[PDB]
């Protein structure tokens, strides 16, 4: 968007002052939408010397004569030209500016407008900026942040030593990565994205996206009336072990609940019988194993089972030992079908295999699994969308990096999912999503499309749970999938 | 407001381009508020070469990429600098402009945005501008006018040969006289007044006002609990004749229904008995007249009746003959109380008397009565607020010039009333308003305040009638006054 503002001024010829005026009035309107009538409130506007501060002076000026009181505290040592222009207007209109933040000043105001730093912040916040931000956060006032809460790195969502906790953030043109990834997402509060007059073509030239309800609705496959089960695809799920007998069942029902026609599971005997006792609509093939885990002796049978399906999911509950590792890698190297690779299949995966496959794959790691896959620390991979993009491009796959905000990428397009809640931070949730992705691929969506629709619907289903989210289990999530689909439509 | 825009740019330093951008975005938001989601509509924007047209280019540009279709027809031979600037932006953003209005083009659009002429129009519209405006008015499309419907004289509300009939008019800063007086008021449709960033001090330096609910609520007098009838004033109404026996009754009840403490009527016997048969709370004093009309022989009695009141109303139903003329003028010259002068008292009034009175007066003519009073034609006085102001200043009075839009002025402040409906175009309505004004003066409001509150409440009462307005009568209006007061509070 730094690019976007510059082209809009330099190539399109929109005066920088017009963009700044539109930015500020949009904050005023946003506030009115959340607070109702503004005339009873007293506003403290905290302005930096940059263009975020300039936007703050526009806000402040537009409140003059209309609200109970407005004061600007200017916290800068110099002003960008647009900030200087809007400072001068604020003062010409009769506005009061002070240059020293006295901690008790907070007592006399209802709303704090945070226009200290925007996307221009670089480096840790120190000194008196930090003391001020901390005082605002302890004040209990309503906080409205201009563009991004001050102290959030707009490219990453990390806190730069400290940051404002906003009730309402008003950003311009498009959301920033820092609104979408945590901790930034938490500090943003309610986000409104304001149209401030950039050409719609430039706004739409962005290559990273938030997954929206309208996007998912347009990707949901068609259900032709004259269909039969094969119309809706066939999935094989290779999953489970004597240790982990539940995973197959959750993956399988995840495929069925999204509309897949036929789902079969290959599960070590007698753990395969667990699935049909719970959901007799599943096909749960018994696999004769030596000690309760898949091994190379099961390679040929699993390849034969794969011949008559559209997609294969592998990994949930397989276990991780050397014999599973041999099986997984040899299977994936030979399988000429799309694969969804999760859990223990990721843990044992040789990435060389991904490079040599002709068929597509989707990988669904959490950050612990991603860290192991690229031999890095969890902190180095968590919310690292550039790493994810590089990995997907280098390995010719779709990568679905699960977290509260889920990143989906094929290395060219990257999508961020914000549906869900903490009830999904519980064993079994990932197994459901794996089945969902395979099911949608089986119905004819591309690996990327299937991943996009699935992460959104999985999170939206969680949110439809009727009692406290901490009590949500994967079994209940399964029941909520068709409701999420209905509500989406 | 020509003044207002210039000071805002030249003294306050707001770039003219910023004001024009704010004007245009305000039209977009106004449209969304009335049409809902704009994305399904096709917009035809008609732009002149002036700043109204410039505002139109801002509207058009802001719709690009967001609605079904936008086309501008540019109808000018040259462009003001701001219009030229916004034309260039419109084109840079990919907007289509044609310079010839083909009559069938209307078929392909849902909404016409009228940005041809604003407050800059001078003189009759001829030629192809007129043909275009007439085609828009025959088209049945939704019409949104920028600032004022093109063809209305913004200072007077007259049609300059022809004018656009708008469904929605969006004006900037303040309403214009042309929105408020007819025929302009009719052609405006629904009016929204947008804040486009003028300093609130300049907006409030205007000396003419629309009478609003908030103004009337703040002027309504207090009702202290420990009161008695005298707290709320005493009114004498000198009214009626053998020809016109109903007028006194309507005036008297008009005073009582607005909260006046005591109302007495002086009416020629036996017509005085009509009043108490209908409303026995009135005092209706019998006056012994020679032939059924007040004359000089009743002067002394009426002066004695005036000693114990706060205000005297005179005129409704008196009749107009030489003996009434002698009485009225001698009475008013001698009466040292505020007077409300209506109807036949206006018809016989010698304005020299107004100049020589020490006490205040309010006059309540309709345009026929005003025309007779200043010896002009009805067309010369109707909606002539400058004449009204001159008359009030020269005669030291408040003038209430009744019409669908009522003008109230003391020569320094002028207020326009827009409440009411056509049920008030019926005999008896004016007699009620006279009593209302006297009553409010008796309660302690200034002549100007009393006139302001009364015209608003009188019109608002009419609008509360539950059946078709053409069936409203003065008797029913009386019943609705206390409801208007309640609703106002």
């Amino acid at each position: 968007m730094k690019e976007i503002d510059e082209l809009t001024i330099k190539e399109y010829g929109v005066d920088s002052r017009i963009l700044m005026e539109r930015a500020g009035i949009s904050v005023v309107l946003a506030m009115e939408e959340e607070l109702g009538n503004l005339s009873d409130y007293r506003f403290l506007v905290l302005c930096g010397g940059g263009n975020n501060g300039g936007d703050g002076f526009v806000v402040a000026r537009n409140l003059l004569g209309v609200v109970k009181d407005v004061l600007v505290v200017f916290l800068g040592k110099k002003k960008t030209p647009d900030c200087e222009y809007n400072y001068g207007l604020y003062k010409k209109f009769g506005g009061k500016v002070v240059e020293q933040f006295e901690p008790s000043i907070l007592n006399e105001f209802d709303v704090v407008v945070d226009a200290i730093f925007g996307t221009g912040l670089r480096g840790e916040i120190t000194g008196e900026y930090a003391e001020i931000i901390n005082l605002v956060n302890k004040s209990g006032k309503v906080v409205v942040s201009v563009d991004v809460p001050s102290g959030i790195d707009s490219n990453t969502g990390k806190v730069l030593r400290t940051a404002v906790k906003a009730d309402l953030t008003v950003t311009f043109g498009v959301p920033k990565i820092g609104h979408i990834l945590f901790p930034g997402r938490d500090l943003t509060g309610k986000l409104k994205v304001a149209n401030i007059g950039h050409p719609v073509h430039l706004i739409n030239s962005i290559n990273r996206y938030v997954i929206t309800r309208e996007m998912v609705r347009s990707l949901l496959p068609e259900r032709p009336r004259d269909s039969h089960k094969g119309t809706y695809g066939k999935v094989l799920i290779i999953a489970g072990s004597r240790l982990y007998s539940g995973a197959p069942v959750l993956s399988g029902m995840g495929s069925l609940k999204v509309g897949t026609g036929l789902v079969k599971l290959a599960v070590p005997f007698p753990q395969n019988l667990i699935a049909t006792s719970r959901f007799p609509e599943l096909i749960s093939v018994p696999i004769d194993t030596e000690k309760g885990f898949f091994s190379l002796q099961n390679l040929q049978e699993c390849l034969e089972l794969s011949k008559d399906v559209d997609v294969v999911a592998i990994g949930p509950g397989l276990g991780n030992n050397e014999h599973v590792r041999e099986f997984v890698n040899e299977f994936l190297k030979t399988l000429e079908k799309p694969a969804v690779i999760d859990a223990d299949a990721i843990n044992v995966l040789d990435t060389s295999v991904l490079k040599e496959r002709k068929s597509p794959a989707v990988l669904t790691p959490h950050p612990g699994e991603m860290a192991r896959l690229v031999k890095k620390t969890v902190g180095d991979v968590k919310y690292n969308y550039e790493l994810a993009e590089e990995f997907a491009k280098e390995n010719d796959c779709v990568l679905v990096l699960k977290s509260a905000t889920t990143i989906v990428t094929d290395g060219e397009k990257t999508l961020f999912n914000i549906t869900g809640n903490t009830g999904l931070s519980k064993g079994g949730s990932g197994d459901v999503l794996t089945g969902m992705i395979a099911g949608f691929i089986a119905q004819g969506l591309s690996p990327l499309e299937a991943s996009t629709v699935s992460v959104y619907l999985h999170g939206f289903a969680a949110e439809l749970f009727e009692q406290d989210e901490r009590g949500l289990t994967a079994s209940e999530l399964l029941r909520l999938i068709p409701e999420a689909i209905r509500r989406l439509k | 407001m020509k003044e207002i825009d210039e000071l805002t740019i030249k003294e306050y330093g707001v770039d003219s381009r910023i004001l024009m951008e704010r004007a245009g975005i305000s039209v977009v938001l106004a449209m969304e508020e009335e049409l809902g989601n704009l994305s399904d509509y096709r917009f035809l924007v008609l732009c002149g070469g002036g700043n109204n047209g410039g505002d139109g280019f801002v509207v058009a540009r802001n719709l690009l990429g967001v609605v079904k279709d936008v086309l501008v027809v540019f109808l000018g031979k040259k462009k003001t600098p701001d219009c030229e600037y916004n034309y260039g932006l419109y084109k840079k953003f990919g907007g289509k402009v044609v310079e010839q209005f083909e009559p069938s083009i209307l078929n392909e659009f849902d909404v016409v945005v009228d940005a041809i002429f604003g407050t800059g129009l001078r003189g009759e519209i001829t030629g192809e501008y007129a043909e275009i405006i007439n085609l828009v008015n025959k088209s049945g499309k939704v019409v949104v006018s920028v600032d004022v419907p093109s063809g209305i004289d913004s200072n007077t509300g007259k049609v300059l040969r022809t004018a656009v009939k708008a469904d929605l008019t969006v004006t900037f800063g303040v309403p214009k006289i042309g929105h408020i007086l007819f025929p302009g008021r009719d052609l405006t449709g629904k009016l929204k007044v947008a804040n486009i960033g003028h300093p609130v001090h300049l907006i409030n330096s205007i000396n003419r006002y629309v009478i609003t609910r908030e103004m009337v609520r703040s002027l309504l007098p207090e009702r202290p609990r420990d009161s008695h009838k005298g707290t709320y004033g005493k009114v004498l109404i000198i009214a009626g004749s053998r020809l016109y026996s109903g007028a006194p009754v309507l005036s008297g009840m008009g005073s009582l229904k607005v909260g006046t403490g005591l109302v007495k009527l002086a009416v020629p016997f036996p017509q005085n008995l009509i009043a108490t048969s209908r409303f026995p709370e009135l005092i209706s004093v019998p006056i012994d007249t020679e032939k059924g009309f007040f004359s000089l022989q009743n002067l002394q009695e009426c002066l004695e009746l005036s000693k114990d009141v706060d205000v005297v109303a005179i005129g409704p139903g008196l009749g107009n003959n030489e003996h009434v003329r002698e009485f009225v003028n001698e009475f008013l010259k001698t009466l040292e109380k505020p007077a409300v002068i209506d109807a036949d008292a206006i018809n016989v009034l010698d304005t020299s008397v107004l100049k020589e009175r020490k006490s205040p007066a309010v006059l309540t003519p309709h345009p026929g009565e005003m025309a007779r009073l200043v010896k002009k034609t009805v067309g010369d006085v109707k909606y002539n607020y400058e004449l009204a102001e001159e008359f009030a200043k020269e005669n030291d009075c408040v003038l209430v010039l009744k019409s669908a839009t009522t003008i109230v002025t003391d020569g320094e402040k002028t207020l326009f009333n827009i409440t009411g409906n056509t049920g008030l175009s019926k005999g008896g309505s004016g007699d009620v308003l006279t009593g209302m004004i006297a009553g409010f003066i008796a309660q302690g409001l200034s002549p100007l305040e009393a006139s302001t509150v009364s015209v608003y409440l009188h019109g608002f009462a009419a609008e509360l009638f539950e059946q078709d307005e053409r069936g409203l009568t003065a008797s029913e209006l009386l019943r609705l006054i206390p409801e208007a007061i309640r609703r106002l509070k």
Binding site: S26, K192, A194, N195 | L29, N37, L38, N62
Partner: peptide, 6 residues
């Protein structure tokens, strides 16, 4: 939605 995506 002309002004805001929420």
């Amino acid at each position: 939605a002309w002004l805001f995506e929420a």
